[PDB]
UniProtKB/Swiss-Prot annotation, chain A:
GO terms for biological process: mRNA splicing, via spliceosome; spliceosomal complex assembly. GO terms for molecular function: RNA binding. The keyword Nucleotide-binding does not apply. Involved in pre-mRNA splicing process. As a component of the minor spliceosome, involved in the splicing of U12-type introns in pre-mRNAs. It is found in: Nucleus; Nucleus speckle. Keywords: Acetylation, mRNA processing, mRNA splicing, Nucleus, Phosphoprotein, Repeat, Spliceosome. Identified in the spliceosome C complex. Present in a spliceosome complex assembled in vitro containing CRNKL1, HPRP8BP and SNRPB2. Component of the minor spliceosome, which splices U12-type introns. Isoform 2 seems to be predominant in the spliceosome complex. Interacts with PPIL2 (via the PPIase cyclophilin-type domain); they may form a trimeric complex with HSP90. The chain holds residues 425 to 802 of 848 of the full protein. One of its GO terms (cellular component) is post-mRNA release spliceosomal complex. The modification Phosphoserine is found at S69. Residues 1-177 are annotated as: Mediates interaction with HSP90. Belongs to the crooked-neck family. This is Crooked neck-like protein 1. HAT repeats lie at residues 3-34, 41-69, 71-99, 109-139, 141-171, 173-196, 198-225, 227-251, 256-288, 290-322.
Curated annotation (Swiss-Prot), chain B:
Keywords: Acetylation, DNA damage, DNA repair, mRNA processing, mRNA splicing, Nucleus, Phosphoprotein, Repeat, Spliceosome, Transcription. One of its GO terms (biological process) is blastocyst development. This is Pre-mRNA-splicing factor SYF1. The keyword Acetylation applies. HAT repeats lie at residues 1-35, 70-94. Associates with RNA polymerase II, the TCR-specific proteins CKN1/CSA and ERCC6/CSB, and XPA. Identified in the spliceosome C complex. Component of the XAB2 complex, a multimeric protein complex composed of XAB2, PRPF19, AQR, ZNF830, ISY1, and PPIE. Identified in a pentameric intron-binding (IB) complex composed of AQR, XAB2, ISY1, ZNF830 and PPIE that is incorporated into the spliceosome as a preassembled complex. The IB complex does not contain PRPF19. The lineage of its organism: Eukaryota, Metazoa, Chordata, Craniata, Vertebrata. Involved in pre-mRNA splicing as component of the spliceosome. Involved in transcription-coupled repair (TCR), transcription and pre-mRNA splicing. It is found in: Nucleus.
Length: 322, 208
């Protein structure tokens, strides 16, 4: 109230050297008051009141004190930088739960380390496939972000579920900047999973042929991808794949005959339908496949009337069959 | 400028004057000095007029630095009602659960938190309702339907019983639905449910 600046700081510093030993809630209140007096550059006690209150938060148990270690470390980070990181490392490791601090610290630890590159990476990384993953995208990427910025986390993440898929995409990007890296992904696909690497390598002819041979050798969704790829490329091998797979699967064989034999679909189709009915009231696919075969026929009015004749023929033959 | 600050030193009477003066320095773009003025106002007028200062002071200072810790602290000092919610809504998108705890620290407020928690993903929201229970039963009833439908699953079904029993013909349809849901096992409990709702019809009819 006497408009003193320096004398108030003398009083405040002469007070808070002994009086906080009980403890410091009124110290933080007087810090906020001194930040108020400075208001009416000068946000020094803003940090000191927050940091004292952060440490003042009692550590009870292991995860509670380690949760507080995440709070005050972020407060210290934004505002002995090594000793605060070391005291943070001992707080996370000294945890009673001993299960969640592995995922909590790793984050904090990595950040601290980042905030020189060769030593930090060796500490975090500290097994046969991991060394094989490193030799393909450590020196080759030559990049601050991604090859070395997923050369350690990616390995750490797996032990991800999409590791064989991500590692195959990493080699395809590194080799192209290629049939050397794509074959390494194709070889690791066999060790369902191999069909993913087969469909990707062919998308970049020879790849398509490889995608077929592989599938064949291996052995309902997997064969549908290989059958649709060999059919779209430009009807003989589409029917061959249907015979060695379809035997959803019955509905797939009907959909295959619609596209492959679109341009003896009625005879064979109906025969199959009846056979399925006999091999198990359940004749809803014979009237439905016949109504679509009639409507799909080229002729409108004549095309729609022909679809009604084909659909009604299956219904009449189905209704008169026990 | 000093000629103006002489006013800050003396003859204080109304806030309008305060916001006006801070707007002067803002026009001169002293920025941080201006924020100081809002510091000097609020030490005076206490939790009433101070809010009238503080809502504009927040909207502005957040607009300036956009540094987190300082303004965060400023809301912290500030907090000692809707202003907290706007402010919290700001902080989360410029810890989230922490904010939800703050809003938690009324039905509409409960509804919001639940929304933001759903934004952080589904799992919390079922959790939120348990906090929610302690007209509210309608909100609670809705949560139970949402929660009763959702299900841990045994604890959830038993919770459906605890909620249906927690406290209306549509609700009878709800308990009857919960009974019907069982593969020939929710009958007895279902008939008991319709019986309880009938008892509610009795207590309702008994009312004058």
């Amino acid at each position: 109230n006497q408009k003193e600046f320096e004398r108030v700081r003398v009083i405040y510093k002469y007070a808070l050297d002994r009086i906080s030993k009980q403890e410091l809630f009124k110290n933080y209140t007087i810090f906020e008051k001194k930040f108020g007096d400075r208001r009416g550059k000068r946000r020094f006690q803003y940090e000191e009141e927050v940091k004292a209150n952060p440490h003042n938060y009692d550590a009870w148990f292991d995860y509670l004190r380690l949760v507080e270690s995440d709070a005050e470390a972020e407060a210290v980070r934004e505002v002995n930088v090594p000793p605060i990181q070391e005291k943070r490392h001992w707080k996370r490791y000294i945890y009673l739960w001993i299960n969640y601090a592995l995922y909590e610290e790793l984050e904090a630890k990595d950040p601290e380390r980042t905030r020189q590159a060769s030593l930090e990476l060796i500490p975090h990384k500290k097994a046969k496939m991991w060394i094989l993953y490193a030799q393909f995208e450590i020196r080759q990427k030559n990049l601050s972000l991604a090859r070395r910025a997923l050369g350690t986390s990616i390995g750490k993440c797996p032990k991800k579920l999409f590791k064989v898929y991500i590692e195959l995409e990493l080699q395809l990007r590194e080799f192209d900047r290629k049939f050397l890296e794509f074959g390494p992904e194709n070889c690791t696909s066999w060790i369902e999973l191999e069909t993913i690497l087969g469909d990707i390598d062919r998308a970049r002819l020879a790849i398509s042929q490889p995608r077929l041979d592989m599938p064949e050798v291996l052995w309902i969704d997997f064969e549908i991808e290989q059958e649709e790829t060999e059919r779209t490329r430009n009807y003989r091998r589409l029917l061959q794949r249907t015979q060695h797979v379809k035997v959803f699967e019955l509905s797939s064989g009907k959909e295959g005959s619609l596209t492959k034999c679109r341009q003896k679909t009625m005879r064979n189709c109906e025969e199959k339908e009846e056979r399925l009915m006999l091999l198990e009231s359940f004749e809803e696919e014979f009237g439905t496949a016949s109504d679509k075969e009639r409507v799909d026929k080229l002729m409108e009015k004549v095309k729609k009337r022909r679809k009604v004749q084909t659909d009604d023929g299956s219904d009449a033959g189905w209704e008169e069959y026990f | 400028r000093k000629l103006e600050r002489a006013r800050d030193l003396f003859e204080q009477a109304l806030d309008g004057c305060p916001p006006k003066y801070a707007k002067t320095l803002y026009l001169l773009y002293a920025q941080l000095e201006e924020e100081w003025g809002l510091a000097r106002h609020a030490m005076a007028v206490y939790e009433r007029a101070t809010r009238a200062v503080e809502p504009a002071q927040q909207y502005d200072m957040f607009n300036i630095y956009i540094a987190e810790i300082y303004g965060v602290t400023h809301t912290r000092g500030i907090y000692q009602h809707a202003r907290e919610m706007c402010l919290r809504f700001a902080d989360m998108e410029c810890g989230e659960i922490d904010r939800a705890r703050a809003i938690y620290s009324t039905w509409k407020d409960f509804e919001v938190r639940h929304g933001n928690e759903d934004t952080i993903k589904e799992m919390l929201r079922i959790r939120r309702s348990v906090q929610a229970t302690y007209f509210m039963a309608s909100q609670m009833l809705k949560v139970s339907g949402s929660a009763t439908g959702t299900v841990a699953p045994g604890q959830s079904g038993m919770d459906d019983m605890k909620l249906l029993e927690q406290r209306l013909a549509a609700e009878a349809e709800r308990d009857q639905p919960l009974r019907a849901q069982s593969k020939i096992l929710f009958v007895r409990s279902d008939a008991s449910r319709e019986e309880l709702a009938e008892l509610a019809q009795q207590v309702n009819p008994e009312e004058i």
